[PDB]
Amino acid sequence: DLTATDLARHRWLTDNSWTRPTWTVAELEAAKAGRTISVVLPALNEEETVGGVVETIRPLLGGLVDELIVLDSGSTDDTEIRAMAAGARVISREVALPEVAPQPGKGEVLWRSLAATTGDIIVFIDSDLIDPDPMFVPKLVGPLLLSEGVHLVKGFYRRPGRVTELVARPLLAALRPELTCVLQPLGGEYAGTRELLMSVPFAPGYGVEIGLLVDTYDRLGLDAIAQVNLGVRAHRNRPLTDLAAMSRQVIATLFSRCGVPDSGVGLVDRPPMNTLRGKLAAALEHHHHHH
Amino acid sequence: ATDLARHRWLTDNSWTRPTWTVAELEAAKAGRTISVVLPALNEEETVGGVVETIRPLLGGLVDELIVLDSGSTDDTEIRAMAAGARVISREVALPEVAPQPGKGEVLWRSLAATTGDIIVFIDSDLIDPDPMFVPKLVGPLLLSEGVHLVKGFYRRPLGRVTELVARPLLAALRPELTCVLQPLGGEYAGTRELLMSVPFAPGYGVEIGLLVDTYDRLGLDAIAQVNLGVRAHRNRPLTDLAAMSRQVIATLFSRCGVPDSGVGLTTSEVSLVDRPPMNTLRGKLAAALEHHHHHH
Ligand SMILES: [Cl-]
Ligand SMILES: [Cl-]
Ligand SMILES: [Mg+2]
Ligand SMILES: [Mg+2]
Ligand SMILES: [Mg+2]
Structure with missing residues (x-):
C-alpha cells in the first residue's frame, strides 16, 4: 500500500519535476520581469x-x-586564465569576501559567491563537467521564473552514483523521507533565489549540496523544491577514498541538520550570508509552524 | 590518542596471520563446546x-x-545434509514463535537449536570456503582472555556498503569501532554468554547490531578480528546494496536512539523491531548453559 511519502512524491513529481524542461531561452528572458x-x-x-x-x-x-x-x-x-579567455569573470575567494579568512572546500566557494554576485537568481554549475550542454542554465532557471513558490531547482541527469544511492538517499529515507523524491540530491548543477540562499547556513566541502537541500526543506517543504532533467550523462568514476570522504561529510551535514550529534572523527558551517551582506534585504517568505 | 587506541587494539585483538592449528585449538577447548x-x-x-x-x-x-x-x-536442504550438516528449519528451531523474514531471524533462532558455549556463523553463499575458517574464528575465544566476538575479515586482491555506509557511520556514532575492518561480515563467532543475552536486529542489520551491542555492553577488548584469507569482493546489484545500507542505517539508528522513519527505498524492506534476547524465551536452556563460575 502507498505510504504518505509515496503520495507526496507522486504529486511532487507531477507539479515540481520536469523530464522534458523545454522552455525556450526567449520565453525565459521575457519572464525575468526585472529579475537578474x-x-x-x-x-x-x-x-x-x-x-x-x-x-x-x-x-x-x-x-x-x-x-x-x-x-x-x-x-x-x-584554470583562471582559461576561464578568462573563454569569456568569464574570475573572482577569488579573498576578493569575493575580504573580511573572512577562507577555509577549504566547495561549500566555502559557493557561500562566498553570494557576496560576489548580484543576481536575484544564482545558478551553480560544476566546472569539472566534461560534456556541458548549453541548455543547462535555461532548464535550471525555468521553475524559478515561471513556477510560483519554487526557490531551489535541482538539475538531474538521466543515465544511459554510489554515494547518492547508498548514503544520501537511504539517510534521507530515515531522517527526511519526503526528500527521497529528489533524484540526485548531491548534484552540483542547481539554482536558487537570492532570498533563499542568503538566509541559510552553508555546510563545508562535500556537504554543501545536501545541506542546502535539507535547510530549504526544513524552511519551506517540498513545495519550494523542483528538479529538471539536464540530459543523459554517464556516471563519472571517482576514487573510493574520495567517495568515502564525500560520504563522511554528507553524513556530518545531514546529522547537524537532523538533530544527530557527530563525533567529529573523520571545517565549520558558515552563517547565512545575510549576516554579512544584503543585511536589510526582504526576508524569505514565512512558513509558519504556529497559527 | 584515538588512533593510539585503535593501534593498540589492532596489536592485541587483530590477527592478519593466525598461526593456530586445529590440534592446539582442540586442546584449548577445556570443556567448552x-x-x-x-x-x-x-x-x-x-x-x-x-x-x-x-x-x-x-x-x-x-x-x-x-x-x-x-x-x-x-x-539447499538435501545438498547440505549430503555434505554432513544437520538441517534445521526456522519452525523447528523455535516452534511457538511465528517466523519473520531476514537473516537476523535465522541467526537468533539458531540460539535455541544449539548447545555450544561458542557459536560460529558462516555464510552458506560463499563461493570459496576454506577449512580453516572455523579454527581462525574460534582462536581468540579459546586462547585469549576476555574476547566474546570474533569478526572474520578478508584481505582484498591488490565492499561499498562497508566503506561508504558502515565505517563512516561508526566514525560518527561509535568512533572506536572504525578499527573493525569488515563490520558487516557474515563470518564471525561469539560466546553463548554474549549471544544469548542481546537482542537481535532484523534482516541485514544483524551483524552491525551485534557489533555495537557487544561494544557497548562488553567493551572494545571483547571484540577481535582475524584474516580468513584473500577473497575478491562479490558483485551485488546496486538495489541490493542500497536495501542493505538502508537496514544497516535503521539498526545503527535504533542502537543510538535516532528516530528512524521506517520508510524504505522506492519499496525496500526496513524493520525497526528487534527480537528479544533468547534468554527471555529459553530461560532454562540459557541457565543450563551458563557456566557455574559466571558470577564468581
Ligand atoms: Cl553520487
Ligand atoms: Cl560491503
Ligand atoms: Mg542588458
Ligand atoms: Mg591564486
Ligand atoms: Mg576537481
Missing part, C-alpha cells in the same frame, strides 16, 4: 574543462544571464 | 561446498554443524 540571473562556476584546478563549461553559457550572457563568474578556490593550474 | 551455524535461503549451488570444509572438524573441534534453513525451495 548570476551563474557561478566553482573551480579548483579544472584547467581541462573550465573553458568548455564557460563556452556553453557564454551565448546567454547579456540576455538570459546577467553575469558569468568563475569563483576560483586557489588553483595552481591554468 | 562449539556449534557452527550456516544460515541458508536458496543456496543450492554453494551450501554443500561450505559444509564440506567444516565437516572434517565435526566430532573434534566442532561439536555440531547445522544449516538453519529459512524456507528454501531449491535443493
Whole structure:
C-alpha cells in the first residue's frame, strides 16, 4: 500500500519535476520581469574543462544571464586564465569576501559567491563537467521564473552514483523521507533565489549540496523544491577514498541538520550570508509552524 | 590518542596471520563446546561446498554443524545434509514463535537449536570456503582472555556498503569501532554468554547490531578480528546494496536512539523491531548453559 511519502512524491513529481524542461531561452528572458540571473562556476584546478563549461553559457550572457563568474578556490593550474579567455569573470575567494579568512572546500566557494554576485537568481554549475550542454542554465532557471513558490531547482541527469544511492538517499529515507523524491540530491548543477540562499547556513566541502537541500526543506517543504532533467550523462568514476570522504561529510551535514550529534572523527558551517551582506534585504517568505 | 587506541587494539585483538592449528585449538577447548551455524535461503549451488570444509572438524573441534534453513525451495536442504550438516528449519528451531523474514531471524533462532558455549556463523553463499575458517574464528575465544566476538575479515586482491555506509557511520556514532575492518561480515563467532543475552536486529542489520551491542555492553577488548584469507569482493546489484545500507542505517539508528522513519527505498524492506534476547524465551536452556563460575 502507498505510504504518505509515496503520495507526496507522486504529486511532487507531477507539479515540481520536469523530464522534458523545454522552455525556450526567449520565453525565459521575457519572464525575468526585472529579475537578474548570476551563474557561478566553482573551480579548483579544472584547467581541462573550465573553458568548455564557460563556452556553453557564454551565448546567454547579456540576455538570459546577467553575469558569468568563475569563483576560483586557489588553483595552481591554468584554470583562471582559461576561464578568462573563454569569456568569464574570475573572482577569488579573498576578493569575493575580504573580511573572512577562507577555509577549504566547495561549500566555502559557493557561500562566498553570494557576496560576489548580484543576481536575484544564482545558478551553480560544476566546472569539472566534461560534456556541458548549453541548455543547462535555461532548464535550471525555468521553475524559478515561471513556477510560483519554487526557490531551489535541482538539475538531474538521466543515465544511459554510489554515494547518492547508498548514503544520501537511504539517510534521507530515515531522517527526511519526503526528500527521497529528489533524484540526485548531491548534484552540483542547481539554482536558487537570492532570498533563499542568503538566509541559510552553508555546510563545508562535500556537504554543501545536501545541506542546502535539507535547510530549504526544513524552511519551506517540498513545495519550494523542483528538479529538471539536464540530459543523459554517464556516471563519472571517482576514487573510493574520495567517495568515502564525500560520504563522511554528507553524513556530518545531514546529522547537524537532523538533530544527530557527530563525533567529529573523520571545517565549520558558515552563517547565512545575510549576516554579512544584503543585511536589510526582504526576508524569505514565512512558513509558519504556529497559527 | 584515538588512533593510539585503535593501534593498540589492532596489536592485541587483530590477527592478519593466525598461526593456530586445529590440534592446539582442540586442546584449548577445556570443556567448552562449539556449534557452527550456516544460515541458508536458496543456496543450492554453494551450501554443500561450505559444509564440506567444516565437516572434517565435526566430532573434534566442532561439536555440531547445522544449516538453519529459512524456507528454501531449491535443493539447499538435501545438498547440505549430503555434505554432513544437520538441517534445521526456522519452525523447528523455535516452534511457538511465528517466523519473520531476514537473516537476523535465522541467526537468533539458531540460539535455541544449539548447545555450544561458542557459536560460529558462516555464510552458506560463499563461493570459496576454506577449512580453516572455523579454527581462525574460534582462536581468540579459546586462547585469549576476555574476547566474546570474533569478526572474520578478508584481505582484498591488490565492499561499498562497508566503506561508504558502515565505517563512516561508526566514525560518527561509535568512533572506536572504525578499527573493525569488515563490520558487516557474515563470518564471525561469539560466546553463548554474549549471544544469548542481546537482542537481535532484523534482516541485514544483524551483524552491525551485534557489533555495537557487544561494544557497548562488553567493551572494545571483547571484540577481535582475524584474516580468513584473500577473497575478491562479490558483485551485488546496486538495489541490493542500497536495501542493505538502508537496514544497516535503521539498526545503527535504533542502537543510538535516532528516530528512524521506517520508510524504505522506492519499496525496500526496513524493520525497526528487534527480537528479544533468547534468554527471555529459553530461560532454562540459557541457565543450563551458563557456566557455574559466571558470577564468581
Ligand atoms: Cl553520487
Ligand atoms: Cl560491503
Ligand atoms: Mg576537481
Ligand atoms: Mg542588458
Ligand atoms: Mg591564486
